[PDB]
């Protein structure tokens, strides 16, 4: 018997009216399938939402431990296990996901085998085990039959383009996703619906359509109860505000921090966001990571030192950075910083140039702002955001 | 029984040494399969290049009439008919292509059925019978098995993006094509190789990598004997030169006109190219179409009138145009022209704005040049090109 059923029975003896509270929370028409779930091994709810919502409602603090246990006892050939694969991925529960994938790739059920292989491609692409060219090649060769995996094959690519800064294929790819084709699995349909709204929000951020960006993140938030999509919606909203409204940006980053502080990753993500925000607005910065030697944290150190005319301190950090291999995006920042330190238009021009190479219509504001202050034509600077 | 075999036998009796002349031209090791082709109904060459090259060599002036007849008597289930479908499409022989497609969709051979359906999607997308979203949907649903149709499904989309001005997804899509996977049909492999070189040349034009552009068009020309790919290679080379070298641009357009003047479409394409060139360099313009009411020709009329300070005449043409529904690209031109007529910086800014909306890194030079002349910062104007 799974930890979730043990905990639900122990809590059912102390409080007998939890039966109809859980049946409503699970979205069921009567307590019937919930009864089945408690007294017969392997009886799974028609929709995976049912158990998720119960766990979130009743054991919010224990979600990972309980869901891990439940998921890893699931018959890998059922609809519930397929739902579990999505649930693990959505939540970034990698150890659950990888076990599920591994049994699914070589099982007798054809539908489970397909989800298995598609999610494997996603995992491999995320970790740089394979190139994008090999991923798409392998996806073609699967002859994908379910509309679920048909959507996920696009989403998986969308994630990869987003994290490598390769924005241009995104707008066209997302328009091809059609979730209305997914009819058997409502958990997957809705989770994917959330995935799409956050992805849309991000695309809009990159094209500098800031209101639309926020409109899409709000749709994301209203569509989900998964921490991960909430984290990234708050992050995107905050970013969409980074240059225009300090207070509202800060509020969004702190909101995100507050729901996610428990998790080291999410914590760091909001720490970095707050750090950026505070350097952009030239405030005192309690969020600088003095212990990291990554390029991002060092640039923030520099940016801060420069903001406060701590010029010698800036130079040391800039010296440390000139020894590190920069990509196009990181070089754009480098030139921005150099430009600020030496008050040199040429550096801002190079900054613009590299932001343009890396297709960044966001951070490019930094060198554009400096040029404005130096009296360059505001009309031209605005067109450079286009 | 086909007109091509009748004409080849009649020409073989009057001149007996045509046997080894045609065998070399067909690329065969000896006259053997050529003998078979002439004296047994339905014997088709191993590679479709063989009959094409013969026809081009021997009946250049009658290629369409003869190839039409030959193609439409072909067993729709053979490799030669599949080759014929490519040959008709490459050449824009639409009446041959549509008949071939239509019999191929519902024949017993699996491979022919697949090429049939893919090319149908291409035809329908080219004519706006279906949307891009429906094309890709329908292609997924075909479960494409051959590497030939796997390449064509990308090429077909590439064509659509190119003709609708939707450049951003192109770079990523073309990188996914791998023609080295096509082993069974050398005609299709090589024709596609030409398709890819021209498409590459065009992508490079749009990204303003002008040397590479030309390098790709030259590869195109050296790889083909199809008029269509020659036309578009000369057009692209000329366009890559439109702003930098008048003489060499003109030479390329005139070369293209000379090999293609017989065909109404190609004629008009070079007429428009020459027209643009000559307005850009502010010469007398032999190529203005005073009889057309399309937006493109009217803008060229205006551009010319403006070049020669015929300001009232310009204004009438501009008035006529404001009554027609404009695209983003057409509006960009409109503002450019308006800008030149009233020497008004605001119009050039709007021009830049709409070129930016339509992802045009080419014609955008026009309003940029005016701003230079009006003394705006050259560094900033350069960055506006990317």
UniProtKB/Swiss-Prot annotation, chains A, B:
InterPro entries: AimR-like (IPR047705). It holds the Pfam family AimR. This is SPbeta prophage-derived uncharacterized protein YopK. It comes from Bacillus subtilis (strain 168). The lineage of its organism: Bacteria, Bacillati, Bacillota, Bacilli, Bacillales.
